Structure formats: structure tokens, C-alpha cells
Amino acid sequence: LSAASRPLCTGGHASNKEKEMVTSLFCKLGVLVRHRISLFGNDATSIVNCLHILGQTLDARTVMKTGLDSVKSALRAFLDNAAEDLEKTMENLKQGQFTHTRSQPKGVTQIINYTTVALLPMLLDKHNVYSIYNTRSSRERAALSLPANVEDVCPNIPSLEKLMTEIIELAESGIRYTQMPYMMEVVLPMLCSYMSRWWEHGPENHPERAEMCCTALNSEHMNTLLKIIYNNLGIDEGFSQPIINKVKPQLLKTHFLPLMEKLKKKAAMVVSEEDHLKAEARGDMSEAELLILDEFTTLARDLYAFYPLLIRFVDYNRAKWLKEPNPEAYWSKSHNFKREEQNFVVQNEINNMSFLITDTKSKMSKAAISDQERKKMKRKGDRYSMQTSLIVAALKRLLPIGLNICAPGDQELIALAKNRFSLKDTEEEVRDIIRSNIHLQGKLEGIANVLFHLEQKSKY
Amino acid sequence: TSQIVLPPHLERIRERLAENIHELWVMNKIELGWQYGPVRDDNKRQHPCLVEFCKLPEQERNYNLQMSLETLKTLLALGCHVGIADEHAEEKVKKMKLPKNYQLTSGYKPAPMDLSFIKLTPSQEAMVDKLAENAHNVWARDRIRQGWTYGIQQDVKNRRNPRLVPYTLLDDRTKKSNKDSLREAVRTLLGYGYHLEAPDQDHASRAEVCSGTGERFRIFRAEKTYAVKAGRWYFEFEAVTAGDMRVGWSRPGCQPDLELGSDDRAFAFDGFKAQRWHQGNEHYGRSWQAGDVVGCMVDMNEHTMMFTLNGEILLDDSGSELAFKDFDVGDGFIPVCS
Incomplete structure (x- = not known):
């Protein structure tokens, strides 16, 4: 009994047979869902028009969940079981998922999409023998410039198949290889070139409705991951690329900074959205030798x-717009935040005085005000x-100034947290709306009153 | 050790490879610098052995063929498949590439080409070292039978060679010539076009993680008379090397013999497995670097336990400063180690 992909090993043969069933049922769905007639084989003994299957439409949806989620601990179990067929199986699964999401399905398979995407960071043909990204390149040419391709270019032009949050979630799911690249760095760069070139050449506002979260397009953004729109660059180059030429990405990164620094709009939801888009577009995800080259990291x-x-300093009560910005962790910024927090504590004390006596009417408005305060x-x-x-x-070795600056805030929050049940129940409701949504505390590598900040402030 | 026998199917490929490797070896020897010698005149840089493959005598040719057969046996006996795909171009699939370069002087100087641009397999150095080790066993057996270069009890020979110990005495600098010769041989093999796998790598489960476990475990603690009962005490433990070490509290001995943190008598915490030890396994804490202080602390009044690694308090998954809770006072607690 030789152990291999499917020579004898039944443990991996279970998942491999699930993959084979996925392929067979994907062919059986490519013969039916994309019928291109919708009336062929009409009246399948009641009314039905089917492509010689007539019984596998729901069964495929039932079994794809089990086939793709063969095990909850997919990343460890797949690597332990095998290291040969995982790449091709995942590539075919992703291609079939794209060729199914092009059509209008009733059920949504976002959870299974995320589960399959979780295999990509965990780490074959090395994207050379088999072109995994050919179908993805077609689907990406469909929207190679979203500000320029926000029209009926999408297949069959519905508002639900592709021109919705589905495409942005699919992009966020598919493009995630921070832990380990799983491609030859060829077929993705010449779509990313069009995307970044149109990002620079846009100067356009007022995007399409129901897709305000355009920031979820890319998560592995970095240099070579614009003036290279390729119309003449293809003839010029085809040997030379940004991997060898380190000049242009540094120039573009230096160009991006002053434009984002110049934005200092006050009291505007549009300013908040512009700042969030700016953070996603030119954040701290550039992992190009930041440890060795520290000047870029420090400036960024x-x-x-x-x-x-400086943005959220004045009052900015409407903090619900920010979903979860990346923090990107003695400092001048630390001192500025300490000053901002000790100024904010005064307004918090004023609000506490308002809550103490002469309370407003409309207990539901009390709940709304408490919810706004809890969000802040x-x-x-x-x-x-x-x-x-x-x-x-900082204060361990020698820094009495930091302890002296932090001392008034401790008393401010201690006075705030004397008896605040009318705020605590609302805070519990807010934290029950979404439990943590980041689980940042449990990573050890969302938030309430008595946690790490409180214990670290009290410990000194 | 001795390895497996050569299957009869490979005899023709062995003969062809032996012939071409003899050719390359003899022209490399000629290129080294020595010239032809009639009879044993090495002092004049004249070598009778330095002749062409066809000009070699019967005994020398037989010895060279046997040596090539042994080396091919050793190469194929590892276990990895050595199914040749890029066959060497000599009268079979002719793609003559040796005369691409050309060097000639006074004498028989054929032109070899070594394709160093091809990627050498990572396991090829392992094959070279294994060939060296097998030949080390060979000359160890020969010297055991003979008694050459050292007189231990006979006191006939002196100047003991460091070849008795296979690896420790013989550094890489001492056998640079043999290492370079084997490197040239495997370079010629790669130029012929042999594709080799790497069984002794991360592809297959072959790595050795720990020499042993389950025993050679010791417990360190003070006298029973120092069993504290009240107050809140502090003591420090420092680690030098990461490994299976349990640090916590014990009790006067009641269980016969068992490791720390797996019974009533002992409380323990671990960072190597990142799990606390108390009548089972419970994940808690992070690992430690070389030269870290566990920084232990006792809270006897309310029956709470906790740790401070280098001033950093350790919090569990639930986010609490409590390592253990709800335990009987017993006969006190004592600092313990494993």
C-alpha cells in the first residue's frame, strides 16, 4: 500500500474525492446554470427545463460546503496530509467558484469563500504548469478600472450578481498571500498595473451606490504587487521590471505622502470617508524592507x-463611520495623544455632570447619547x-514626565466610572450588537472599560 | 555499513557512465600537470598512471571499473529514484557538447565541458558526504585488518592518521582535494543531466527533533520546613535554554512519583508548550527567549497564583491575572522546579 495523493491513503482520498465530486458537479452545473437557452428540455414531466440532470442543483450546494470545508483546521491538516495536490485542487475550486459567482445564485457562499481563502496564507506547479489565475484575470479584466468600468460591462448587468459588495468581498477573499506568495508574480502584476494607474489617473468622486466600501479591494498591496500602463512598456521591456528597478516605487511612495498630508478638512463625513480611503490606499502595508530602510517607515x-x-480632536461624535482602521504599531505622537486625551476628559467630565443631575427627557434619546459616548x-x-x-x-528606566502626564487621566476615568449603570447597559447593548469583530485582545501577538488599558494604567 | 546490490538492468548504463567518467578523470589528471612516466618516477613529475582510458592496463582498468561500479551502487542505494531522463550524449542520443570548449597542449588532451550553470540538487552534497562516509568505513576496515600508519600494541608504526574518526578529526579543510574531486564528479553528472530528489529535507518526514524524553527528569525544591502558609512571597527563576521545564509550587510528597503539575501535590507553569500544568493540560502564557526570568509571585491570602515574566504579567485566553484558583491550603507551598 503506497501512500500518495490517491494511491492508497484514504484519509486524504476523502478530501480528494470531495474535490473530484466538486469538479464533476461543476461540469454538471456548467451544462445547466449557464443554459444559454433556459427552455431546452422544457417540461421535465412537470414544468422543468433541465440539462439532463434535473436533480443535482440543490445537491451540489449541499455537498460543496462539505467538500471545501473538509476539516475545520484546514491549514494544518492539509499541510500534514499532503503537499502536492493542494495547490491544483484549490486553484480549480477557486476557478469554479468564480465561474459560479458570475451567475445569479440564491444562497450566498461568502463563508465558504473565506474558508477556501484561508488555505492561501498556509504554505507544486508554482503557477507555471497550470494557469490558476487565467479565469481570475478574465474576471479582473471585467473590472480592471472600477472608476472607469462602473457601467454595464459586468456580465448580464444585474445589480446583484457582480455589481455589489459580492465582487469586493470576492477580491478581498481571493487576494491574500501575506504569509507566503503562491504565484509566479506575472499574471497579477499586469492587472495591478491597470488598477494602480487608474487609481492615479482618476481624479473622480461620487462613486456608485451600495458599494461604498471600495477599500476592501486589496490587502496584500506593496511595490509591484504610474507610467507603466504597458502600451509602450511592453515593447520597451519585452527582462526589466520593478523587481530590478527600485527607483520608481520609491518615487511614487514619496509622491503619495504630501497629497494625503494636505487633506485637513474639518467636520465632514466626506472628509472622514476620504481619510479612510487614503489610509487604505497608502497605509503601512508596504513591507518592502521597512526593517532595514527605516526612514520611510518613520515618516509614514x-x-x-x-x-x-488632529482629525478627531474637536468633537467628532459620529465615530460609526470608521469600521476598523489598522493601528500599524516615548514619542511626539504619544505626547500629542496624551494632550488630546486629557482635553477630551474635560468634555467627558462635563457629560458626566450632565448625567448626574438635570437629565434630559426621552429615555430613548438618553440611550442614543449613551451609545454615541460608548462609540467614542x-x-x-x-x-x-x-x-x-x-x-x-518608558517610565521604567527614566521618564517621570510620562507618569505625571498620565496621572490626571487615571483620576478622570476613576471619577467617570463611579456609578454609570444607565451608560453601562447601553454599552452592553452596543457591545452585543457586534461582539468584538476583531478580537484584538485575544490575538496576543471590541473593547470595554476594565481591560488592558485600565490595568496597565493602574499598574504603573 | 554496506548498501544494496546493483540490479542487472543497469549494467549497460553503468558501463557507459564508467567509460565516460574514466575519460574525464584521466584528462583531468593530465590537466593537473604531471606527465607520462615509464616506471615509478613520481619524483620527476612523471606518472605511469596518467594515461588515456584506452591506454590503461588491464589491472588498472578493472580497478577503475570496480570503483565506478561501487560509486554508482552507492548513488543508487539511497532510495530516491535515479531514473535517468536526460541521457548522456554518447553514441546513443548524440547531442555532442564536450567539444564546445577546446584546450590542447603537447600530449593527449581531449576537451571536457562541465555544465556548472545547471542548478545542483540540494541533496547532492549529502550524496557526496555519504560517499565520503562509506569510503571512510572502507579504509577503516582496511586499517583494522592491516595496522597501517599506527602501531598501538605492535609498536611497528607511528604518526597516526586522523582518518580513524570519520568526521570529528577530519575537518573540511583537510580533505579539500577529495571534496573538490567529488564535487567535480557530481558536476559532470549534473552536466550529463541527472535529476535527483531530496529525501532528507522538509519534503519527507525525516528530521530528528529530540534525543529522548520520558525519563532523565529531576525535581528541585527546598526543605519541607520552609513551606509557607501566610503572606505573599516572591521568588525568581531564570532560563538559559528553551525546553521542557516546569516551574511552580509543590507540596510535601504524597504521590509516589510523577512529573510536575500532573497531580494534587504540584502546581506548575510551562512556556515551552505554552500551557499551564495542573492535573492535565491547559494552554496559558507565551514562550521565552534565551536568558529570560520567569519572575514568580505568591498570593496565599486569597489562593491566587500568577507570574511576571521580565515584569510582563501573563494573562490567559480569558484575559485574567489568575494562573490558579480554588485550591486547598494543605500543608503549605514550596518553590519547585523541573
């Missing part, structure tokens, strides 16, 4: 810390926790 981190501190507290709690963690280490 300083700007990404100076922007929101949730937004500020993370940065307060990182600042306290930085301060505690």
Missing part, C-alpha cells in the same frame, strides 16, 4: 499618527491602551 508612521489625532470610548480605548503600554515601559 509619523504621518499616519499625526492625521487622525470604544474608538479611543485602543489607542489609549497602546499609549499606556508605551508609557509604562
Whole structure:
């Protein structure tokens, strides 16, 4: 009994047979769902028009979930079981998923899409023998410039098949290889070139409705991952690329910074959305030798810390627009945040005085005000926790100034947290609307009152 | 050790490979610098052995063929498939590539080409080292039978060679010539076009992780008279190398013999497995670097336990400063180690 992909090993043969059933049923769905007639074989003994199957439409949906989710711990189990057929099986599964999401399905398979995407960071043909990304390149040529391709280019032009949040979630699911690249770095760059070139050549606002979260397009963004729109660059090059030429990405990164620094609009939801889009477009995901080359990292981190501190300073009660910005972790930014927090504590004390006596009517408006305050507290709690963690280490060797600056905030929050049940029940409701949604505390590598920030502030 | 026998199907490929490797070896020897010698005049840089493959005598040819057969046996006996796909171009699939380069002087100087541009397999150095080790066993057996270059009890020979110990005495610098010769041989093999796998890598489960476990475990603690009962105490433990070490509290001995944190008598915490030890396994804490202080602390008043690794408090998955809770006072607790 020789152990191999499917020579004798039944443990991996189970998942491989699930994959083979996926392929067979995907052919059986390509003969039926994309009928191109919708009346062929009409009246299958009641009314039905089927492509010689008539019984596998729902069964395929029932069994694809089990086939793709063969095991909950997919990343470890797949690597332990085999290291040969996983790439081709996942590639064919992704291609079939795209060729099924092009059509209008009733059920949504976003969870299974995320589960299959989870295999990509875990780490064959090396994308050379088999072109995994050919169908994805077609589906990406369908929207190679979203500001320029926001029209009826989408297949069959519905508002539900592709021109919705489905395509952005599919892109976020598919493009995730931060832990380990799983491609030859050929077929993705010459779509990313069009995407980034049109990002620079846009100057357009007012995007399409129901797809405001355009920021979920890319998560593995970095250099070579614009003036290279390729119309003449293909003839010029085809040997030379951004891997060898390190000049242009640095120039573009230096160009991006002053434009984003110049944005200092005050009291505008459009300013908030522009800042979020700016953070996603030119954040701190550039992992191109940041440890060795530290000047770029320092400048980028300083700007990404100076922007929101000066943005959210005044009141900015409507903090629900920010979903989950990446923090991208003694400092001047730390001192500025300490000043901002000690100024914010005064308004918090004023609100506490308002809650103490002469309470407003409309208990539902009390709940709304408490929810707004809880949202502000949730937004500020993370940065307060990182600042306290930085301060505690700073004051160890020699930094009495940090402890003296942090002392009034401790008393401010202690006075705030005396008896606030009318705020605590609303905070519980807010935290029950979405439990944590990031589970940042449990990573050890969303937030309430008595956690890491409070204990670190109290420990000193 | 001795390895498996050569299957009869490979005899023709063995003969062809032996012939071409003899040709390359003799022209490399000629290129080394020595010249032809009539009879044993090495002092004049004249070597009778330095002749062409066809000009070799019967005994020398037989010895060279046997040596090539042994090396091919050793190459094929590893276990990895050596099914040749890029056959060497000599009167079979002729793609003559040796005369691409050309060097000639006074004498018989055929032109060899070594394709160093091809990627050498990562396991090829392992094959070279294994060939060296098998030949080390060969000359170890020969010296055991003979008693050459050292007189231990006979006191006939002196100047003991470091070849008795296979690897420790013989450094890489000492056998640079043999290493370079084997490297040239495997380079010629790669130029012929042999594709080799890497069984002794991460592709197959062959790595050795730990020499042993389950025993040679020791327990360190003080006298029973120091069993604290009240107050809140502090003691420090420092780690030098990562490994199976349990640090916590014990009790006066009641269980016969068992490791720390797996019975009533002992409480323990681990970072190598990142799990606390108390009547089972419960994930808790992170690992430690070389030269870290566990920083233990005792809270006897309310029956709570906790740790401070280098001033950093350790919190569990639930996010609490409590390693253990709800345990009887017993006969006190004592600092313990494994």
C-alpha cells in the first residue's frame, strides 16, 4: 500500500474525492446554470427545463460546503496530509467558484469563500504548469478600472450578481498571500498595473451606490504587487521590471505622502470617508524592507499618527463611520495623544455632570447619547491602551514626565466610572450588537472599560 | 555499513557512465600537470598512471571499473529514484557538447565541458558526504585488518592518521582535494543531466527533533520546613535554554512519583508548550527567549497564583491575572522546579 495523493491513503482520498465530486458537479452545473437557452428540455414531466440532470442543483450546494470545508483546521491538516495536490485542487475550486459567482445564485457562499481563502496564507506547479489565475484575470479584466468600468460591462448587468459588495468581498477573499506568495508574480502584476494607474489617473468622486466600501479591494498591496500602463512598456521591456528597478516605487511612495498630508478638512463625513480611503490606499502595508530602510517607515508612521489625532480632536461624535482602521504599531505622537486625551476628559467630565443631575427627557434619546459616548470610548480605548503600554515601559528606566502626564487621566476615568449603570447597559447593548469583530485582545501577538488599558494604567 | 546490490538492468548504463567518467578523470589528471612516466618516477613529475582510458592496463582498468561500479551502487542505494531522463550524449542520443570548449597542449588532451550553470540538487552534497562516509568505513576496515600508519600494541608504526574518526578529526579543510574531486564528479553528472530528489529535507518526514524524553527528569525544591502558609512571597527563576521545564509550587510528597503539575501535590507553569500544568493540560502564557526570568509571585491570602515574566504579567485566553484558583491550603507551598 503506497501512500500518495490517491494511491492508497484514504484519509486524504476523502478530501480528494470531495474535490473530484466538486469538479464533476461543476461540469454538471456548467451544462445547466449557464443554459444559454433556459427552455431546452422544457417540461421535465412537470414544468422543468433541465440539462439532463434535473436533480443535482440543490445537491451540489449541499455537498460543496462539505467538500471545501473538509476539516475545520484546514491549514494544518492539509499541510500534514499532503503537499502536492493542494495547490491544483484549490486553484480549480477557486476557478469554479468564480465561474459560479458570475451567475445569479440564491444562497450566498461568502463563508465558504473565506474558508477556501484561508488555505492561501498556509504554505507544486508554482503557477507555471497550470494557469490558476487565467479565469481570475478574465474576471479582473471585467473590472480592471472600477472608476472607469462602473457601467454595464459586468456580465448580464444585474445589480446583484457582480455589481455589489459580492465582487469586493470576492477580491478581498481571493487576494491574500501575506504569509507566503503562491504565484509566479506575472499574471497579477499586469492587472495591478491597470488598477494602480487608474487609481492615479482618476481624479473622480461620487462613486456608485451600495458599494461604498471600495477599500476592501486589496490587502496584500506593496511595490509591484504610474507610467507603466504597458502600451509602450511592453515593447520597451519585452527582462526589466520593478523587481530590478527600485527607483520608481520609491518615487511614487514619496509622491503619495504630501497629497494625503494636505487633506485637513474639518467636520465632514466626506472628509472622514476620504481619510479612510487614503489610509487604505497608502497605509503601512508596504513591507518592502521597512526593517532595514527605516526612514520611510518613520515618516509614514509619523504621518499616519499625526492625521487622525488632529482629525478627531474637536468633537467628532459620529465615530460609526470608521469600521476598523489598522493601528500599524516615548514619542511626539504619544505626547500629542496624551494632550488630546486629557482635553477630551474635560468634555467627558462635563457629560458626566450632565448625567448626574438635570437629565434630559426621552429615555430613548438618553440611550442614543449613551451609545454615541460608548462609540467614542470604544474608538479611543485602543489607542489609549497602546499609549499606556508605551508609557509604562518608558517610565521604567527614566521618564517621570510620562507618569505625571498620565496621572490626571487615571483620576478622570476613576471619577467617570463611579456609578454609570444607565451608560453601562447601553454599552452592553452596543457591545452585543457586534461582539468584538476583531478580537484584538485575544490575538496576543471590541473593547470595554476594565481591560488592558485600565490595568496597565493602574499598574504603573 | 554496506548498501544494496546493483540490479542487472543497469549494467549497460553503468558501463557507459564508467567509460565516460574514466575519460574525464584521466584528462583531468593530465590537466593537473604531471606527465607520462615509464616506471615509478613520481619524483620527476612523471606518472605511469596518467594515461588515456584506452591506454590503461588491464589491472588498472578493472580497478577503475570496480570503483565506478561501487560509486554508482552507492548513488543508487539511497532510495530516491535515479531514473535517468536526460541521457548522456554518447553514441546513443548524440547531442555532442564536450567539444564546445577546446584546450590542447603537447600530449593527449581531449576537451571536457562541465555544465556548472545547471542548478545542483540540494541533496547532492549529502550524496557526496555519504560517499565520503562509506569510503571512510572502507579504509577503516582496511586499517583494522592491516595496522597501517599506527602501531598501538605492535609498536611497528607511528604518526597516526586522523582518518580513524570519520568526521570529528577530519575537518573540511583537510580533505579539500577529495571534496573538490567529488564535487567535480557530481558536476559532470549534473552536466550529463541527472535529476535527483531530496529525501532528507522538509519534503519527507525525516528530521530528528529530540534525543529522548520520558525519563532523565529531576525535581528541585527546598526543605519541607520552609513551606509557607501566610503572606505573599516572591521568588525568581531564570532560563538559559528553551525546553521542557516546569516551574511552580509543590507540596510535601504524597504521590509516589510523577512529573510536575500532573497531580494534587504540584502546581506548575510551562512556556515551552505554552500551557499551564495542573492535573492535565491547559494552554496559558507565551514562550521565552534565551536568558529570560520567569519572575514568580505568591498570593496565599486569597489562593491566587500568577507570574511576571521580565515584569510582563501573563494573562490567559480569558484575559485574567489568575494562573490558579480554588485550591486547598494543605500543608503549605514550596518553590519547585523541573
